[PDB]
Amino acid sequence: PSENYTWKNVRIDGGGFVPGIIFNQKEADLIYARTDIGGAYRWNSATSSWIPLLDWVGWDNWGWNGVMSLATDAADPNRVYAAVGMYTNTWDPNNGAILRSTDRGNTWQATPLPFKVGGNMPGRGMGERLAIDPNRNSIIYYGAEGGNGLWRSTDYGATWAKVSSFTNGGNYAQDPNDPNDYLNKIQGVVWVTFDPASGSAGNTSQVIYVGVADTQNAIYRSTDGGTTWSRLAGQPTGFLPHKGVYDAVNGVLYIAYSDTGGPYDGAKGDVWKFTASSGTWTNISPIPSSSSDLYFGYSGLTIDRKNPNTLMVASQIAWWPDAVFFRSTNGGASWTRIWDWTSYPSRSFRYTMDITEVPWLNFGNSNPVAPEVSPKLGWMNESVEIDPHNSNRLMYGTGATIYATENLTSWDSGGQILLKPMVKGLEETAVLDVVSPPVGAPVYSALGDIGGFRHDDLTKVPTSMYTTPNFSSTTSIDFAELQPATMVRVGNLDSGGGIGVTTNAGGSWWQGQNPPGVTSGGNVALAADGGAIVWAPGGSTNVYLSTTFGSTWTAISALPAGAVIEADRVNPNKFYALANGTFYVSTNKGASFSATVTAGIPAAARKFKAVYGREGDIWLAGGSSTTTYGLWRSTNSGASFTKLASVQEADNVTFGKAATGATYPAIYIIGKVDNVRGVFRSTNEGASWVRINDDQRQYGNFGEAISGDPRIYGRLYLGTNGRGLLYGDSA
């Protein structure tokens, strides 16, 4: 059966890249955001929070959490569309899709495309690829990747076909020779922009502009409602157009260019203005690419719709000391910048920043050496948007957050703007590991990109990610079952990898020494009494034991590198490892391991966990649909495992507080039971299961990290890859 649960995010606020923010041009406070791996959101002004729209994307169609583009209809603000799909290489096995809605994303229908959409590919900060005809709103265009060219729907997104008169599908890729097959894809047709004055209400807009990722042919135009297309005469060459923003008030098309597709790079570019009546092109770059002072391209182009001589553009990309934003109030004839050098390394600023609501955005150092400041203005700032209903509001995306101001026009009177994060409810992290100890804080997260946190209160943003050491990503975390204030975490930082240890539950950490060959965190296990650490780091040729709480290491000879390691939760002498269809057991506190199981368990399986309070009770989950699949359990310290016949497939497993009157902890799996995919609880040792999620709450490629709560019956900590860390409670 099912059981009513309540699902919420553990509060973090942001944590990842927001490639696109979209304001509806007609309705005030109608705002959407798109992400690369965690779906799309609609702003809710009444609760000052974002609402996720795609949590119904599930196991089979997981790449639809990749949102390459989004369009909100100025002629009918009920209508919204999204172009979805995550990878255009082999990593996403499915094609993309155009999703359509008539209730602002509350429900959708899908129309699958015959090609892939690259929501988390290079170039994803260019856009918007999807555009609706502002005069005749049944017409929608989509600029596609991969040489698919320009595509069109004339029935409100229900059916889509190639525009065969648009013959340039693009030839740029970030690195054509990438042997990893990630940087080598054609980024394609990158945005579509209408001239609203070229049609009238109910009639096809005759003038449409299209940007293509081709340095020699970046801009096309149709003047006949999309029947035929021309490269635009007199345009510049050598750069890729990140943004094309049309102003019908002055009859000009503004384009921001960079020498790469983004979102991580860009060394040169220009901003141009094309005047439509005359066909004239003018370089209005704040700093032109011909200047050797220029060390970035341009993106974050936006026009102030209420005052359309005002526009802004930003660096794509300036890493050092920070992003630069430029503002003009005279159509690009001249510009001012959001900061200026005074005497190196000092700067003056036209802004201040308040991150009290999201204090970890200092990245654990509020005072880096000048010229740097913390928090930074931003990076990967492709989306910069002025509210078309309020000249004083602007919002931009970074690699970590969205920042917003409500006094933007202070800039023009010589004041400073105030910027703050605006990411409540926009939960975008990838959860790599998670623990719930039986005393102290309810949960600790191990996250990509922003480290992870001790969560003292699940409704309050934590003050700081882990420090000393401060990992960029924490890949594994463990606590000593019988002394939970003793913890260890491994992860990635600057060069390679490292280990942090604590004996006061993280009030204080310190950094341990590394065994040879460490390039990333890998995974780690802590003995139940805290007296041994076994670490399988990334890069290293072995797994290692420390008997000195991280200060020294010895190679473990029988274990393959990268084996999954877990400690028994009762007996400090017992450790276990899983690698490629072999289970291994140590009874001498990690000094040596021997293979105990070599057959009968899927080679793909790579998740298992020992049960607190149950010495030698181990549950193991994994497999694949083309091999074998399921949940297995050992009650004899890994000497053997039995497959649970009640489960068809499983991918992770954990334990939590027993039901009242039950004799065994509750068991939680990511899996498939009785032909339903979802999240499942058993309160009878796996004899039967109850689904605790539902079809609106599937979260795509979730479940890499899960934990039950030994103190709270029914509670599951549910990690996702792009939707942060959830907690579910029975209702």
Ligand X SMILES: OC[C@H]1O[C@@H](O[C@H]2[C@@H](OC[C@H]3O[C@@H](O[C@H]4[C@H](O)[C@@H](O)[C@H](O[C@H]5[C@H](O)[C@@H](O)[C@H](O)O[C@@H]5CO)O[C@@H]4CO[C@H]4OC[C@@H](O)[C@H](O)[C@H]4O[C@@H]4O[C@H](CO)[C@H](O)[C@H](O)[C@H]4O)[C@H](O)[C@@H](O)[C@@H]3O[C@@H]3O[C@H](CO[C@H]4OC[C@@H](O)[C@H](O)[C@H]4O)[C@@H](O)[C@H](O)[C@H]3O)OC[C@@H](O)[C@@H]2O)[C@H](O)[C@@H](O)[C@H]1O
Ligand Y SMILES: OC[C@H]1O[C@@H](O[C@H]2[C@@H](OC[C@H]3O[C@@H](O[C@H]4[C@H](O)[C@@H](O)[C@H](O)O[C@@H]4CO)[C@H](O)[C@@H](O)[C@@H]3O[C@@H]3O[C@H](CO[C@H]4OC[C@@H](O)[C@H](O)[C@H]4O)[C@@H](O[C@@H]4O[C@H](CO)[C@@H](O)[C@H](O)[C@H]4O)[C@H](O)[C@H]3O)OC[C@@H](O)[C@@H]2O)[C@H](O)[C@@H](O)[C@H]1O
Taking CB under 6 A as the criterion, the residue among 226, 375, 497, 656 binding ligand X is 375
376 binds ligand X (CB under 6 A): yes
Which of K ion, Br ion, ligand Y, none lies near 448, with the C-beta cut-off 5 to 8 A by kind? ligand Y
The nearer residue to ligand X, 17 or 246, going by C-beta atoms, is 17
Please, which of residues 136-195 interact with ligand X by CB under 6 A? Answer: none
Q: Least distance (Å) from K ion to the CB of residue 223? A: 18
Instruction: Give the DSSP letter string of 59-128.
Output: STTGGGG-EEEEEE-TT-TT-EEEEE-S-SSTTS-S--EEEEESSTTSS-EEEE-SS---TTSTTTTS--
Span interacting with ligand X, options 369-377, 553-561, 573-581, 719-727, rule CB under 6 A: 369-377
Identify whether 449 is a catalytic site residue: yes
The nearer residue to ligand X, 63 or 678, going by C-beta atoms, is 63
Instruction: Give the DSSP letter string of 465-534.
Output: ---SS--SEEEEEEEETTEEEEEEEEEE-SSSEEEEEESSTTSS-EE----TT--EEEEEEE-TTS--EE
The nearer residue to K ion, 317 or 518, going by C-beta atoms, is 317
Question: What's the token pair of residue 317?
Answer: 């990309």
The phi and psi torsions of 362 (rounded to 5 degrees) equal -80, -5
368 binds ligand X (CB under 6 A): yes
C-alpha to C-alpha distance for 229 and 403, rounded to whole angstroms:
38
Q: From the candidates 36, 73, 214, 651, give the one annotated as an active-site residue.
A: 36
Q: Which helix (H) or strand (E) holds 28?
A: none
C-alpha to C-alpha distance for 525 and 523, rounded to whole angstroms:
7
Sign of CA dihedral 522, 527, 528, 530: negative
Please check whether residue 572 is in contact with residue 589, taking contact to mean a CB–CB distance below 8 angstroms: yes
Please, which of residues 419-478 interact with ligand Y by CB under 6 A? Answer: 430, 448-449
Taking CB under 5 A as the criterion, the residue among 320, 344, 367, 459 binding Br ion is 320
Q: Least distance (Å) from Br ion to the CB of residue 180? A: 24
Taking CB under 6 A as the criterion, the residue among 61, 65, 69, 120 binding ligand Y is 120
The nearer residue to K ion, 303 or 563, going by C-beta atoms, is 303
Burial per residue of 197-226, b for 16 or more beta-carbon CB atoms within 10 angstroms, e otherwise? bbbeeeebbbbbbbbbbbbeebbbbbeebb
Residues binding K ion: what is the number (CB under 5 A)? 5
Span interacting with Br ion, options 117-125, 320-328, 365-373, 552-560, rule CB under 5 A: 320-328
The nearer residue to K ion, 121 or 317, going by C-beta atoms, is 317
Q: Least distance (Å) from ligand X to the CB of residue 570? A: 36
C-alpha to C-alpha distance for 301 and 335, rounded to whole angstroms:
13
Single-letter residue type at 562? G
219 binds K ion (CB under 5 A): no
The nearer residue to K ion, 267 or 418, going by C-beta atoms, is 267
C-alpha to C-alpha distance for 277 and 284, rounded to whole angstroms:
18
Please check whether residue 109 is in contact with residue 99, taking contact to mean a CB–CB distance below 8 angstroms: yes
C-alpha to C-alpha distance for 42 and 27, rounded to whole angstroms:
13
C-alpha to C-alpha distance for 202 and 261, rounded to whole angstroms:
36
Q: Which helix (H) or strand (E) holds 428?
A: none
The nearer residue to ligand X, 394 or 465, going by C-beta atoms, is 465
Span interacting with K ion, options 173-181, 260-268, 658-666, 669-677, rule CB under 5 A: 260-268
The contacts of residue 622 (CB under 8 Å, 6+ apart) are: 602, 604, 605, 606, 607, 629, 650, 651
Residues binding Br ion: what is the number (CB under 5 A)? 3
Residues binding ligand X: what is the number (CB under 6 A)? 16
Q: Least distance (Å) from Br ion to the CB of residue 295? A: 5
319 binds Br ion (CB under 5 A): yes
Span interacting with K ion, options 113-121, 128-136, 432-440, 685-693, rule CB under 5 A: 128-136
Which of ligand X, ligand Y, K ion, none lies near 721, with the C-beta cut-off 5 to 8 A by kind? ligand Y
Please, which of residues 375-414 interact with Br ion by CB under 5 A? Answer: none
Please, which of residues 250-289 interact with ligand X by CB under 6 A? Answer: 264-265
Build a one-symbol-per-residue string for 344-383: x at contacts with ligand Y by CB under 6 A, - elsewhere. Answer: ----------------------------------------
Go through the chain and tell me how many residues it has. 731
16 binds ligand X (CB under 6 A): yes
The nearer residue to ligand X, 369 or 599, going by C-beta atoms, is 369
The residue numbers preceding gaps of C to N over 2.5 A in the chain are none
Please, which of residues 191-210 interact with K ion by CB under 5 A? Answer: 191
Q: From the candidates 73, 247, 449, 617, give the one annotated as an active-site residue.
A: 449
C-alpha to C-alpha distance for 611 and 709, rounded to whole angstroms:
12
The nearer residue to K ion, 267 or 561, going by C-beta atoms, is 267
The contacts of residue 225 (CB under 8 Å, 6+ apart) are: 199, 204, 205, 206, 208
Q: Least distance (Å) from ligand X to the CB of residue 346? A: 18
Build a one-symbol-per-residue string for 37-76: x at contacts with ligand Y by CB under 6 A, - elsewhere. Answer: x------------------------x--------------
Q: Which residue is nearest to Br ion (CB)?
A: 319
The contacts of residue 388 (CB under 8 Å, 6+ apart) are: 23, 25, 304, 305, 306
36 binds ligand Y (CB under 6 A): yes
Taking CB under 6 A as the criterion, the residue among 49, 102, 235, 374 binding ligand X is 374
Please check whether residue 269 is in contact with residue 290, taking contact to mean a CB–CB distance below 8 angstroms: no
Sign of CA dihedral 180, 127, 397, 373: positive
Based on its alpha-carbon atoms, the radius of gyration of the chain, rounded to whole angstroms, reads 27
379 binds ligand X (CB under 6 A): yes
Please, which of residues 143-202 interact with ligand Y by CB under 6 A? Answer: 180, 182
Neighbours of 496 (CB within 10 A): 16
C-alpha to C-alpha distance for 726 and 720, rounded to whole angstroms:
8
Single-letter residue type at 113? L
640 binds ligand X (CB under 6 A): no
Taking CB under 6 A as the criterion, the residue among 400, 533, 644, 692 binding ligand X is 400
627 binds ligand Y (CB under 6 A): no
Span interacting with ligand X, options 301-309, 372-380, 664-672, 679-687, rule CB under 6 A: 372-380
The nearer residue to K ion, 133 or 428, going by C-beta atoms, is 133
Which of ligand X, ligand Y, K ion, none lies near 368, with the C-beta cut-off 5 to 8 A by kind? ligand X
Give the CA-trace dihedral at 225, 231, 237, 238, to 10 degrees.
80
344 binds Br ion (CB under 5 A): no
The contacts of residue 467 (CB under 8 Å, 6+ apart) are: 364, 509
Please, which of residues 471-530 interact with ligand X by CB under 6 A? Answer: 472
Identify whether 456 is a catalytic site residue: no
* Interface residue list for Br ion (CB under 5 A): 318-320
Give the catalytic positions in this structure.
36, 449
* Interface residue list for ligand X (CB under 6 A): 16-17, 264-265, 319-320, 363, 368, 374-376, 379, 399-400, 449, 472
* Interface residue list for ligand Y (CB under 6 A): 16-17, 36-37, 62, 91, 120, 180, 182, 399, 430, 448-449, 701, 721
